[PDB]
Amino acid sequence: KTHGTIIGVTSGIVLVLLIISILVQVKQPRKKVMACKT
Amino acid sequence: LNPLSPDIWMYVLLACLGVSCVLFVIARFSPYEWYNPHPCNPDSDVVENNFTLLNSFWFGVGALMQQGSELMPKALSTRIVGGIWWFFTLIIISSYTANLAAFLTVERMESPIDSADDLAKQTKIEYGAVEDGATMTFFKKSKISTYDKMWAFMSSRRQSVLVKSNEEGIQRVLTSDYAFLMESTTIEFVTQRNCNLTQIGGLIDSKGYGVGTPMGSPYRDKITIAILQLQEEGKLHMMKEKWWRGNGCPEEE
Amino acid sequence: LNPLSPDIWMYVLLACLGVSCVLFVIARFSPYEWYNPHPCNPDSDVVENNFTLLNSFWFGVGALMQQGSELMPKALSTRIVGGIWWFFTLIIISSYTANLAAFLTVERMESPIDSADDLAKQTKIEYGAVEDGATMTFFKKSKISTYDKMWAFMSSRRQSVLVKSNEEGIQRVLTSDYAFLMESTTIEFVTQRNCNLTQIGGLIDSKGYGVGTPMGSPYRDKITIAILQLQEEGKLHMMKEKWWRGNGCPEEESKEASALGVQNIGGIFIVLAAGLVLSVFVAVGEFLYKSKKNA
Amino acid sequence: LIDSKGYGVGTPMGSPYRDKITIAILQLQEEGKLHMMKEKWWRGNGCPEEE
Numbered sequence: 334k335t336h337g338t339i340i341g342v343t344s345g346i347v348l349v350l351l352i353i354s355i356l357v358q359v360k361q362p363r364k365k366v367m368a369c370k371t
Numbered sequence: 372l373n374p375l376s377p378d379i380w381m382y383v384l385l386a387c388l389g390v391s392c393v394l395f396v397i398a399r400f401s402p403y404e405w406y407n408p409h410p411c412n413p414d415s416d417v418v419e420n421n422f423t424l425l426n427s428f429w430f431g432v433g434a435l436m437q438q439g440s441e442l443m444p445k446a447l448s449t450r451i452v453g454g455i456w457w458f459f460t461l462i463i464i465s466s467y468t469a470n471l472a473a474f475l476t477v478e479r480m481e482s483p484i485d486s487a488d489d490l491a492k493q494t495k496i497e498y499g500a501v502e503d504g505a506t507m508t509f510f511k512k513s514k515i516s517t518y519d520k521m522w523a524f525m526s527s528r529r530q531s532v533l534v535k536s537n538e539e540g541i542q543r544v545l546t547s548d549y550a551f552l553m554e555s556t557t558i559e560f561v562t563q564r565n566c567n568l569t570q571i572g573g574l575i576d577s578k579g580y581g582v583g584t585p586m587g588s589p590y591r592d593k594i595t596i597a598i599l600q601l602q603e604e605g606k607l608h609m610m611k612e613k614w615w616r617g618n619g620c621p622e623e624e
Numbered sequence: 625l626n627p628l629s630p631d632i633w634m635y636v637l638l639a640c641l642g643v644s645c646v647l648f649v650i651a652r653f654s655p656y657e658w659y660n661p662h663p664c665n666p667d668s669d670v671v672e673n674n675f676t677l678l679n680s681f682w683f684g685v686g687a688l689m690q691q692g693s694e695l696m697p698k699a700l701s702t703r704i705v706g707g708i709w710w711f712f713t714l715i716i717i718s719s720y721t722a723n724l725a726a727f728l729t730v731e732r733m734e735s736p737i738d739s740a741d742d743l744a745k746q747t748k749i750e751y752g753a754v755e756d757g758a759t760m761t762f763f764k765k766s767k768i769s770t771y772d773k774m775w776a777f778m779s780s781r782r783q784s785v786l787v788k789s790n791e792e793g794i795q796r797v798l799t800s801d802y803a804f805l806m807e808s809t810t811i812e813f814v815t816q817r818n819c820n821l822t823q824i825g826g827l828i829d830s831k832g833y834g835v836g837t838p839m840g841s842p843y844r845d846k847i848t849i850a851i852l853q854l855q856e857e858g859k860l861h862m863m864k865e866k867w868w869r870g871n872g873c874p875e876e877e878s879k880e881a882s883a884l885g886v887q888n889i890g891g892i893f894i895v896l897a898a899g900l901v902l903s904v905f906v907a908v909g910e911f912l913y914k915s916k917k918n919a
Numbered sequence: 920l921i922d923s924k925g926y927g928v929g930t931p932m933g934s935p936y937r938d939k940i941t942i943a944i945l946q947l948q949e950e951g952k953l954h955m956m957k958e959k960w961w962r963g964n965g966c967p968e969e970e
């Protein structure tokens with residue numbers, strides 16, 4: 334699964350998409366906690 | 372998972388995650404979306420969105436999962452995005468069923484080779500036989516145009532495919548596309564006691580199993596009568612069972 | 625959108641718009657379609673119509689996909705419209721998947737190898753071979769009963785399939801559909817050079833290149849050993865490569881399954897990304913316009 | 920084939936033709952002529968086109 338993830342046409346694209354997804358998931362609970370406060 | 376290549380599956384993963392997160396980050400930051408909780412809400416000051424990670428995450432999970440979830444969107448942006456999500460999942464799964472139907476049909480409509488002449492027309496599948504096992508000899512001296520061209524193909528390989536040893540052609544068939552035309556009895560014996568193997572077609576020839584005697588043998592007519600008795604009885608049937616299927620059936624798939 | 629006429633593709637969008645607008649029309653002047661806000665309280669108005677300009681378009685959209693929203697009306701004169709709507713949705717959905725299925729099934733059945741060994745029983749590619757070379761001479765008297773038919777058909781149309789020479793044969797191939805038939809060595813070399821020109825099929829026959837010699841001369845039988853020595857060394861193989869290496873054609877997907885992939889599905893994801901970025905754009909636009917109305 | 924039976928030619932006892940006809944039958948059988956003429960006299964219409 335190391336090669337399966339790493340070996341892809343421009344896994345770079347895979348990594349970029351994963352980065353976007355992870356970062357936005359990180360964005361979420363900030364507004365979650367702020368809404369809970371409010 | 373076969374009818375959809377594992378080049379899309381991770382794309383489902385990433386696309387779902389993106390749709391869910393983006394639709395939430397659109398929906399939370401919107402001025403309309405906040406709403407009054409109470410049923411007989413007398414214009415309170417507690418309007419707020421309901422959406423939580425769990426609410427939107429499995430909103431995507433259900434929509435992708437081909438089932439309407441709860442929490443209808445309200446704002447223009449969230450509603451259009453969720454519509455796009457609905458559209459995406461619909462088109463994907465419809466395509467999915469399409470391709471799987473493609474496989475099932477195309478497999479169902481295949482036809483396995485059955486006829487000796489059907490193999491005559493064929494070229495890739497290789498005919499075979501233990502040469503000089505009285506079989507290919509009949510092909511040499513066959514008169515039917517089919518059998519004639521099988522013998523022509525045999526001569527064409529010129530022993531390149533022809534084998535001299537039954538079991539060796541057996542393994543060749545096990546491992547390659549080989550016919551190894553032999554006699555019926557060994558066919559039945561092996562097939563009933565083997566895996567992956569099949570009797571194919573009918574019977575080309577009509578050889579007979581008899582008893583050899585000199586011109587003067589008193590037992591000739593007597594034994595003709597005796598064998599007509601046994602075959603009338605059919606004890607030979609149970610004998611064939613004993614030595615062909617008595618091992619065939621327990622070793623039968 | 626291939627398995628449908630684009631005519632319908634636009635008619636359906638305009639019919640979306642039409643059904644939505646007429647739905648709002650029927651909803652507006654409808655008495656039964658006025659729910660009572662604060663329902664547990666008997667002291668309020670009946671402004672609740674479950675329908676805005678937004679709601680009609682929204683439900684026209686979201687009813688289509690088999691999820692639906694919970695914005696159902698309550699009047700009989702409305703449900704009827706909704707029923708016709710969902711019936712149209714069912715017909716379009718049942719057509720689309722079916723037609724995509726028909727496409728892909730035909731594609732699967734589209735065997736491309738040309739039988740890969742016998743363009744016989746095809747009778748339409750108009751194969752060919754170097755005129756009166758070695759090939760037809762084999763096909764002459766070749767009684768394999770498949771390659772016989774090949775000879776028959778090349779014999780019939782012996783004006784277009786028989787080609788002047790190797791270069792002219794391959795040029796005729798480049799011209800139009802013209803399968804070509806000659807010695808595997810030249811086949812390999814020239815396809816070793818013209819990379820996107822295509823190798824077809826395995827082997828058919830096998831002949832011998834040896835060395836000619838004066839009759840009964842001792843040289844032959846003592847050059848035989850040298851030939852054998854060169855063989856059983858291996859200089860033959862690398863030497864063969866050194867004149868047959870040429871330029872390597874980039875590989876092609878033969879083994880890998882023709883199961884659905886991105887080369888056939890991709891566009892929708894980019895559709896999604898464009899739509900959602902458009903959506904965030906108009907979202908911040910609407911938020912700032914909300915503020916501008918307030919401020 | 921549920922059962923096995925054979926059509927053979929009848930003659931009284933001691934007929935010299937029993938053996939001379941057995942050899943003839945074997946040769947004609949190896950000639951496959953029996954096969955083709957059986958096909959002919961058991962040919963009939965053939966299968967129509969039904970797909």
Ligand SMILES: *[C@@H]1O[C@H](CO)[C@@H](O)[C@H](O)[C@H]1NC(C)=O
Nearest residue numbers: 542543544545546547548567
């Ligand atoms: C199926 O066909 C392939 C083709 O080469 C062959 O190698 C293999 O032994 C066959 N059987 C199985 C079980 O794969």
Ligand SMILES: *[C@@H]1O[C@H](CO)[C@@H](O)[C@H](O)[C@H]1NC(C)=O
Nearest residue numbers: 542545546564565566567568
């Ligand atoms: C039949 O093929 C299977 C693989 O598909 C193999 O495991 C098994 O040993 C074979 N049985 C034979 C060749 O009798």
Ligand SMILES: *[C@@H]1O[C@H](CO)[C@@H](O)[C@H](O)[C@H]1NC(C)=O
Nearest residue numbers: 797798817818819820821822
């Ligand atoms: C191969 O690629 C070249 C591109 O330079 C093109 O001109 C040619 O038509 C292609 N096909 C063949 C069979 O050469």
